[PDB]
Design an enzyme around this catalytic site. Structure first.
Site, PDB file in Angstrom:
ATOM      1  N   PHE A 174       2.020   3.941  -8.776  1.00  0.00           N
ATOM      2  CA  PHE A 174       2.414   4.623  -7.547  1.00  0.00           C
ATOM      3  C   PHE A 174       3.052   3.587  -6.639  1.00  0.00           C
ATOM      4  CE2 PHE A 174       2.151   6.854  -3.516  1.00  0.00           C
ATOM      5  CZ  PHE A 174       2.382   8.168  -3.892  1.00  0.00           C
ATOM      6  N   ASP A 210      14.453  10.396  -3.812  1.00  0.00           N
ATOM      7  CA  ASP A 210      13.896   9.065  -3.955  1.00  0.00           C
ATOM      8  C   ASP A 210      13.385   8.740  -5.351  1.00  0.00           C
ATOM      9  OD1 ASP A 210      11.846  10.906  -3.717  1.00  0.00           O
ATOM     10  OD2 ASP A 210      10.706   9.764  -2.221  1.00  0.00           O
ATOM     11  N   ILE A 211      12.498   9.575  -5.876  1.00  0.00           N
ATOM     12  CA  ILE A 211      11.932   9.295  -7.185  1.00  0.00           C
ATOM     13  C   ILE A 211      11.560  10.532  -7.994  1.00  0.00           C
ATOM     14  CG2 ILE A 211       9.667   9.044  -6.099  1.00  0.00           C
ATOM     15  CD1 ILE A 211       9.003   6.943  -8.327  1.00  0.00           C
TER      16      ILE A 211
HETATM   17  O1  LIG Z   1       5.035   6.817  -6.833  1.00  0.00           O
HETATM   18  C1  LIG Z   1       5.411   7.465  -5.850  1.00  0.00           C
HETATM   19  N1  LIG Z   1       5.448   6.868  -4.575  1.00  0.00           N
HETATM   20  C2  LIG Z   1       5.861   7.518  -3.399  1.00  0.00           C
HETATM   21  N2  LIG Z   1       6.278   8.822  -3.391  1.00  0.00           N
HETATM   22  C3  LIG Z   1       6.248   9.429  -4.640  1.00  0.00           C
HETATM   23  C4  LIG Z   1       6.615  10.750  -4.974  1.00  0.00           C
HETATM   24  C5  LIG Z   1       7.154  11.887  -4.102  1.00  0.00           C
HETATM   25  N3  LIG Z   1       7.091  13.075  -4.874  1.00  0.00           N
HETATM   26  C6  LIG Z   1       8.374  13.576  -5.252  1.00  0.00           C
HETATM   27  C7  LIG Z   1       8.571  13.466  -6.716  1.00  0.00           C
HETATM   28  O2  LIG Z   1       7.486  14.152  -7.318  1.00  0.00           O
HETATM   29  P1  LIG Z   1       7.449  14.863  -8.698  1.00  0.00           P
HETATM   30  O3  LIG Z   1       8.550  14.318  -9.519  1.00  0.00           O
HETATM   31  O4  LIG Z   1       6.156  14.390  -9.237  1.00  0.00           O
HETATM   32  O5  LIG Z   1       7.503  16.317  -8.537  1.00  0.00           O
HETATM   33  C8  LIG Z   1       9.438  12.804  -4.539  1.00  0.00           C
HETATM   34  O6  LIG Z   1      10.043  13.701  -3.612  1.00  0.00           O
HETATM   35  C9  LIG Z   1       8.677  11.687  -3.895  1.00  0.00           C
HETATM   36  O7  LIG Z   1       8.969  11.588  -2.503  1.00  0.00           O
HETATM   37  C10 LIG Z   1       6.388  10.817  -6.355  1.00  0.00           C
HETATM   38  N4  LIG Z   1       5.939   9.729  -6.896  1.00  0.00           N
HETATM   39  C11 LIG Z   1       5.844   8.831  -5.839  1.00  0.00           C
HETATM   40 MG   LIG Z   2       9.588  13.576  -1.506  1.00  0.00          MG
END
Ligand SMILES: O=c1[nH]cnc2c([C@@H]3N[C@H](COP(=O)(O)O)[C@@H](O)[C@H]3O)c[nH]c12
Ligand SMILES: [Mg+2]
Ligand SMILES: O=c1[nH]cnc2c([C@@H]3N[C@H](COP(=O)(O)O)[C@@H](O)[C@H]3O)c[nH]c12
Ligand SMILES: O=c1[nH]cnc2c([C@@H]3N[C@H](COP(=O)(O)O)[C@@H](O)[C@H]3O)c[nH]c12
Ligand SMILES: O=c1[nH]cnc2c([C@@H]3N[C@H](COP(=O)(O)O)[C@@H](O)[C@H]3O)c[nH]c12
Ligand SMILES: [Mg+2]
Ligand SMILES: [Mg+2]
Ligand SMILES: [Mg+2]
Ligand SMILES: [Mg+2]
Ligand SMILES: [Mg+2]
Ligand SMILES: [Mg+2]
Ligand SMILES: [Mg+2]
Lengths: 227, 227, 227, 227
Positions: C196, C144-145
């Site tokens: 977020f 997703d992100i």
């Molecule tokens: O802004 C946000 N909104 C909702 N979920 C997320 C996430 C969740 N965290 C994961 C990414 O985290 P990261 O890149 O920080 O390790 C993804 O699997 C997302 O589902 C990060 N940022 C966000």
């Molecule tokens: Mg996730």
């Protein structure tokens, strides 16, 4: 080749065959609360109509290929069919389209009227309009349902005077009624039992057009909304 | 209450505001291969238009409640808008409908022509079923875009002779052009910069109606398809 | 060729760029009544996300061609993305498929957890069917992100022990945050400001996953649902 | 009240009944070219499945009302069902939602496996995961099809140890096979003849999941893709 024997459906593919007893309980699908008392059953669900129209669009694309043609919508019961047909036709054409390709069709509308209650008046009103733009063009008539066959037999006759190059017929439903005059479409979605149907743009005195599924209006609805 | 001051948009909610430089590269979304060379960019993607129309249907339902009204489709540019509106109006209405509910709207079509290339010819041509059938009815005009405001100011003037109960306007786009005569819709989707747009049924000499997104035709496109 | 440098996004196409001040008022689109008070605005409407994902599927199909690959869904935030991708991948592939064609992809799920409230706990927990079944396979990670880049850099590191033939990344959003560790996807939908986001399966403590549009949770929302 | 007798389907509404000879020719609908030779016919078109799932979502909403529950998806054949169910459930709930309302459900996934070719292995693999989060919660299991009934009989037994408050079952298909063990769902989409079906996420050794319609794999497909 492109069909050009209006009413003969010379190379028409067989439609989906809805048996005389086919259908579903109204409680098996989403039905607007206030319409329930006016219908006996669901004949063809919205989703199956959409799936079938997608194949019809595929059949049409396969017949016309890259040949430019013009879709003539017979308002207003034709709306549901027309919209889904255009959606699928455009995706099929545009997905296979190449940089050197060109648009596949033009779109036109013609309001035609002949019904009162659940019967044809034997007369047909055609909202006049210069159809000269169709001269020498391949036209694909898009209609909702062939019942007695009067609308299409008559409209096709009317079309002749405009020196159209070719005339083909795409029809969503064809009713198995003894009143049928023999008019056949070149592309047909479903063959249905002898019952007045409403839904998917098809109405009963302007009612039921918004009903998503093709259903059978019961006697109470016919009486309640009689002209 | 139900709107009845055509051109005033007395209680219209603000539309989505598309900035002068808003848009997306053509390579960011699906674009028919052969159309790419005739578009400068995507202004409003198909999905945003659909999402906005759903809210617009919500607003309209909120204003009319259960009051029966008649939707007047201004062919041919408003087809995309019109069908999307009906879909959402029907679901929103039917989802909250009760056994004692009633249908919400009737549907009608009028073909109005005035454009040649990317300008208004300053004239208006009409074709439709008898509009006298709108007498004493609440009518909601469904239009694609307000540019100079000539089409709607003129058409609404013509509607006066049929003793319609109420006349309101639902418009997908409203262009920020110095040519605007001031005509305002009661329900408007987007406010866009001064550029000729195509897609979502909006055309340039009958071309691009099948383009899914609202885009800007480049000069090559205007030249290639000049009348 | 098929991507195989996880984190480098060596030949990734640019994503749609969502400016720091891009967005829409909540009243411009449909928002669940009870969620309104917890969102500051709509950042990316559902329709634009869907349109972009279709193009992303087009890009992926273009890269893989007919090479069989395996899509790895990173639960739970990527569900919306994942299902939309499959839909478009399947249609695009099957529309051009021939009698001698073959399926294009397999599908798998892995649940990865690391967030609490709106921050990464700096840890990672995994749950999935044996990943040894990916040996010698081309796998496409669907996420997703990308925020800090911890989830993907870590997960991709763990994937190394299973002798996967190739590992590529498809990401819906990539946040422009100073916390980013540099991990880049090979296919990315949108580049968004440092906020977020929730909606389209993205949550805040399991809330808002059903919200159709990608929106910004306001402080009241973060406070109300703090863990 | 909320169902809580797993396998009894105490107050289950009758499903759509697909007769032994019901179905359609592959040529009546869109079928991926390369899959055609491996299927004998279309059993339930994609569109009818979607329409039926919408009513099931309505049935579920009607049973749970505003009571918070948790949907537990049985991966991976359950995907098609699950996605459509969530879409419709969310719209139904959110359309009737008020400012003081709250989310209706939480979502969970569990990978369960037991089939090889077209037969159950009599064994069930459950990808372990702490389900303590469901303690004291109302859970709605979402499954694709009840065949022998082993998967659900077993999974429900497994669920017991987690002190869940209530356990209900939503199932898309139920097969009329003599192998059935008597397990009944609380919400069931369709009752189908005794044939191995593929499509709508349901597979045959990981093949056919992308097929839009529920079809019958023929002996040649079973042999071609046998394990
Ligand atoms: O802004 C946000 N909104 C909702 N979920 C997320 C996430 C969740 N965290 C994961 C990414 O985290 P990261 O890149 O920080 O390790 C993804 O699997 C997302 O589902 C990060 N940022 C966000
Ligand atoms: Mg996730
Ligand atoms: O069963 C029906 N339900 C709803 N509309 C119709 C019609 C309308 N009447 C026309 C076909 O009639 P006919 O073939 O009898 O001339 C079409 O334009 C239809 O819109 C026929 N039968 C039906
Ligand atoms: O930028 C445009 N793109 C496509 N069509 C149009 C039109 C068409 N012209 C009508 C509005 O014109 P006007 O407001 O200028 O009288 C609508 O019915 C549109 O279909 C105006 N501007 C545009
Ligand atoms: O006819 C079928 N086609 C495709 N999958 C299946 C299944 C899979 N097997 C499980 C049901 O099997 P059973 O009830 O026999 O334990 C479900 O989880 C299904 O995903 C059973 N029958 C079929
Ligand atoms: Mg008609
Ligand atoms: Mg009629
Ligand atoms: Mg116009
Ligand atoms: Mg025009
Ligand atoms: Mg999360
Ligand atoms: Mg299964
Ligand atoms: Mg299976």
């Amino acid at each position: 080749p492109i069909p050009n024997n209006p009413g003969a459906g010379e190379n028409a593919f067989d439609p989906v065959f809805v048996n005389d007893d086919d259908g579903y309980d109204l409680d098996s699908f989403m039905i607007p609360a206030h319409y329930k008392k006016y219908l006996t059953k669901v004949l063809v669900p919205n989703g199956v109509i959409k799936n079938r129209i997608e194949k019809l669009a595929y059949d049409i694309k396969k017949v016309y290929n890259n040949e430019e043609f013009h879709i003539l919508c017979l308002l207003k019961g034709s709306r549901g069919f027309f919209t889904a047909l255009l959606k699928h036709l455009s995706r099929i054409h545009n997905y296979s389209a190449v940089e050197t390709s060109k648009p596949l069709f033009g779109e036109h509308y013609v309001r035609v009227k002949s019904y009162c209650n659940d019967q044809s008046t034997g007369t047909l009103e055609i909202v006049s309009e210069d159809l000269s733009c169709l001269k020498g063009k391949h036209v694909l008539i898009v209609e909702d349902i062939i019942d007695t066959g009067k609308t299409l037999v008559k409209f096709c006759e009317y079309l002749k005077k405009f020196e159209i190059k070719t005339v083909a017929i795409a029809c969503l439903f064809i009713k198995r009624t003894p009143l049928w005059n023999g008019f056949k479409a070149d592309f047909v979605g479903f063959s249905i039992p002898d019952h007045f149907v409403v839904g998917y743009s098809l109405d009963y005195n302007e009612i039921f057009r918004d009903l998503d599924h093709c259903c059978l209006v019961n006697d109470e609805g016919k009486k309640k909304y009689k002209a």
